């Protein structure tokens, strides 16, 4: 708020002002990979990749 001095104060009334801040989002973050079905005979690398992605 403003503060004002004196007795008269005539024609010197102020208004109200409240400011704002905006919160937004970003883009999604991804781990994205492709595997052929022959690569899933042993799936250990696939699981370890999931853990690395986390």
């Amino acid at each position: 708020s403003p503060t004002q001095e004196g007795w008269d104060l005539t024609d010197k009334a102020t208004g109200l002002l409240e400011l704002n801040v905006a919160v937004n989002m970003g883009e999604p973050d991804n781990d994205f990979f492709q595997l052929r079905a022959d690569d899933l005979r042993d799936e250990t690398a696939y699981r370890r990749r999931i853990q690395s992605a986390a």
């Binding site: 022959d38 690569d39 005979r41 042993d42």
Partner: protein
Amino acid sequence: ALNEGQIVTLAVDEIIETISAITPMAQKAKKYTPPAASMQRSSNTIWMPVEQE
């Protein structure tokens, strides 16, 4: 005589069999299924011992 509606019917159970399915050479061949997990890491190659002299 009797002029009525006509139909065309297909035999549900009778299939004309053509092309023989003989595989004389493949039945004399041996079949091997190696462990797939190791096959994946071994470039789909496995080594077989030969009987030693």
